[PDB]
Every structure is written in structure tokens, then in C-alpha cells.
Amino acid sequence: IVGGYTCGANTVPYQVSLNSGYHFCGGSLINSQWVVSAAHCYKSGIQVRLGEDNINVVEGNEQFISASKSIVHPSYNSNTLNNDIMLIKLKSAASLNSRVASISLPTSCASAGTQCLISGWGNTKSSGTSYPDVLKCLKAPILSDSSCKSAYPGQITSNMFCAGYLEGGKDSCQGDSGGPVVCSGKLQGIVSWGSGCAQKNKPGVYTKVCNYVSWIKQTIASN
Ligand SMILES: [Ca+2]
């Protein structure tokens, strides 16, 4: 997260870190057994780390649970990033309390102008590289479809939305991938892609979670 703020420990209780020897992506806990992330975050041997603030220090609220199975969206295209969503099942159910909690799925899509919270452990610099140990947060609005398409001609599908600031300086970034965009207590987006980070006229692009609720529910019901 570039141009954000330190969230505070366990203030984003649905945020998870996906670990394969190291943090590599975010995700969102949506029930005791399941995490939503980006399909571009797929790999084998994932450990889901819940209850994290400092990802390099054991601070007392962590639950580390291996994934039993990952399900990339059936129509994910890794070239275009269309349908950039994946479900991850935990081998055992997480213990839920106020520091580790699920986030609700949307029942309606969010509109441009809605304010959201984007979070993660990704790079905090728009030029060069600095990875934080503690969770970072950014409040940002959803942008209009027309501004999003104008920013990224030929690239924005009906399964994507832009959020952030056209002036630059405030965005998600590498290592935030897969993490949440939460608006009015609902998971509306997944950190997906963008041109660099925090660049002028190049806002963040997010997977439009409301399009996937049917798939998520039916997949959980049978897996
Ligand atoms: Ca920790």
C-alpha cells in the first residue's frame, strides 16, 4: 500500500497473509473454512496466516492453517486477468473472535464514489521498494467505469473496477495482490492489477466480487 496508514494490530480481522515460506499475497476470510484471494496468487503449498499484524514477529493472535485445496475461477485468464479470483479451503476451521473474523459477501454491487478500505503488506513505495512488516491501510473511492476504461483502454472488463486516486500517490501495490477492498462492511473487491503503483492516471484495478457471489456460495456448498 502506497500512501496509506498503519491500520493497527488486528483492526482488519478478515485480512489474511498467504505464506509459502514468506508472505506473497493477501486474502480475505469469508467463513471459518474459506478464504477469497486473486487467481494470480495461485500456488501449491499455501499456509494461510490469520490474526497477523507484524508478519515477521509472533505477537500472540496468529492462527496458521495449511490450505487443503485451492479453486481458481473456471474462466480465469492470466493474460487479461479477467476473472481474477480464487478460493482457498483451510484444513481446519479458524477460531473466530474479534481479532479473527470473516467478512460478509456483498448482496449488491457497489457504486462509483463509495468509500472503501484496501489493506495489505505490499510495497509502500511507488518508485523502488520497501515492504512493511505491519499491515497498511488505505481509504479510497470506487471510480466510475468510464474513468476506469479511459485510464486503461481495451483492458477493463465487466469483472473489474477501478478504485483510488487519479492524481497518483495512493494505491495498492505488489504484495497486496489478493487482498480485500471492503466497502460498508462488505467485500466488494480483490487487489488484482495496475500499471506500476500510485502513478498518475493509473488507478488500481480490482476484481468485482459481487459478480462471483453465486459461484462462491455454490463452490463452498459442494467442497
Ligand atoms: Ca505475526
Side-chain angles (χ1 to χ4, degrees):
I1 303 286
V2 178
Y5 62 101
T6 295
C7 301
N10 310 296
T11 61
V12 187
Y14 51 86
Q15 172 83 232
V16 311
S17 169
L18 307 182
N19 187 105
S20 60
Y22 45 86
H23 168 84
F24 69 89
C25 272
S28 301
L29 189 65
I30 61 162
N31 69 25
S32 67
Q33 290 191 293
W34 288 91
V35 165
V36 170
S37 187
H40 82 262
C41 291
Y42 164 78
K43 58 167 72 184
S44 56
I46 295 174
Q47 186 187 63
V48 176
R49 299 191 165 204
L50 311 104
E52 287 282 20
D53 189 45
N54 190 316
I55 49 165
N56 277 320
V57 181
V58 177
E59 299 178 298
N61 294 293
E62 297 88 351
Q63 295 174 50
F64 296 172
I65 304 169
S66 297
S68 61
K69 71 180 78 161
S70 284
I71 302 172
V72 166
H73 193 277
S75 298
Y76 172 56
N77 183 305
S78 60
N79 293 327
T80 63
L81 302 181
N82 196 30
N83 308 293
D84 190 15
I85 185 168
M86 173 182 67
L87 286 163
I88 300 167
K89 194 182 186 179
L90 305 181
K91 278 182 188 264
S92 61
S95 188
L96 305 178
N97 47 77
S98 287
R99 294 182 176 256
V100 177
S102 55
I103 190 66
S104 292
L105 294 174
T107 58
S108 55
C109 295
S111 301
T114 301
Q115 285 289 338
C116 306
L117 185 71
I118 307 177
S119 50
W121 292 273
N123 189 0
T124 61
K125 306 292 217 70
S126 53
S127 299
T129 300
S130 183
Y131 287 85
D133 304 308
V134 301
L135 189 64
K136 305 293 183 163
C137 275
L138 176 65
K139 291 183 178 182
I142 299 180
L143 300 172
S144 65
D145 186 57
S146 60
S147 62
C148 190
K149 291 176 167 175
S150 291
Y152 294 105
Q155 301 157 70
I156 304 300
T157 75
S158 64
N159 300 308
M160 300 171 190
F161 67 91
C162 290
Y165 296 91
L166 297 180
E167 63 262 41
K170 298 168 142 203
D171 195 5
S172 60
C173 201
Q174 282 70 47
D176 294 319
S177 290
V181 181
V182 167
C183 319
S184 302
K186 310 301 189 169
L187 184 64
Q188 292 285 185
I190 301 165
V191 180
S192 183
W193 64 274
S195 176
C197 303
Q199 303 300 116
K200 191 180 129 49
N201 293 126
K202 293 291 179 184
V205 192
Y206 298 94
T207 309
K208 190 170 175 170
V209 173
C210 65
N211 296 355
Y212 299 98
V213 172
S214 177
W215 172 74
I216 293 166
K217 289 182 168 188
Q218 78 93 351
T219 298
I220 288 176
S222 286
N223 286 278

